[PDB]
Amino acid sequence: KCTKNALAQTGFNKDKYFNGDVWYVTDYLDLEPDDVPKRYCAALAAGTASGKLKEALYHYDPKTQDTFYDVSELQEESPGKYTANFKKVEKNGNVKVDVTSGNYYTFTVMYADDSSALIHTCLHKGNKDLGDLYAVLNRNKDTNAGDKVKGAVTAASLKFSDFISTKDNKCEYDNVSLKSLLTK
Ligand code: HEM
Ligand SMILES: NCCc1c[nH]cn1
């Protein structure tokens, strides 16, 4: 089950956030981790296309090399708070799983600047919650969390010590497809 009391950034700048660029998940805190251990890689590209906010998502498992993509049309609930109805797609946009009613995620930009961000996500799949997930994002995949996003982690009453770094997971990203999926 997820918390809805996540606080959106005061004076959050949509323009720089939703610029069509890629954000890398450099650290994360899964509050409801799966039973089986999984090395994780994820990146996303939030922008706009044909009049809408769009977000394209990428997950990768270094170990199995399994990869999946999702692209969603975003609905602003409030500045900094968005609901996303996703569809799983091939890297060229061919739909593998259509948009469906109990399938969607919500996120709250808790902190953001030109280079970094702290988001909270709540994944809902099949009318069921997959639990809270907080992620530290960076425009550069090799950059360590700075003092500002860390103060933001503390400010949300979390411990950065409890966050898992993806820096050593031998991650690989497909930025080209991420960006082109933005219009699919
Ligand atoms: C950066 C923000 C992220 C967002 C918005 C996000 C969103 C999602 C979405 C939409 C799905 C559904 C895929 C589909 O079925 O079409 C998914 C699945 C999955 N994600 Fe993420 N994710 C993020 C970060 C990550 C990270 C860092 C991890 C590692 C904890 C993670 C692990 C997984 C796993 C294990 C699945 C399969 C779900 C299941 O267990 O059924 N994701 N994610
Ligand atoms: N507890 C895992 C939920 C999740 C995975 N990806 C995004 N959210």
SS3 assignment for the chain: CCCCCCCCCCCCCHHHHCCCCEEEEEEEEECCCCCCCCCCEEEEEEEEECCEEEEEEEEECCCCCCEEEEEEEEEEEECCEEEEEEEEECCCCCEEECCCCCCEEEEEEEEECCCEEEEEEEEECCCCEEEEEEEEEECCCCCCCCHHHHHHHHHCCCCHHHCEECCCCCCCCCHHHHHHHCCC
Q: Any residues with Cβ below 6 Å from ligand 2, and which?
A: 30, 32, 121, 123, 130-131, 133
- Tokens for 159, please give them: 């411990």
Instruction: Name residue 44's beta-bridge partners.
Output: 23, 57
Name which of 5, 2, 1, 30 is nearest 110 in CA terms: 5
Technique used: X-ray
* CATH (domain of 80): 2.40.128.20
169 Cα to the center of ligand 1, angstroms:
16
- Provide the residue range defining the domain that includes 33: 1-184
Structure token pair of residue 132:
């809270």
Q: How many domains does the chain have?
A: 1
Cα separation, 161 vs 73, in Å, equals 34
**Tokens 């933001």 map to which residue?**
152
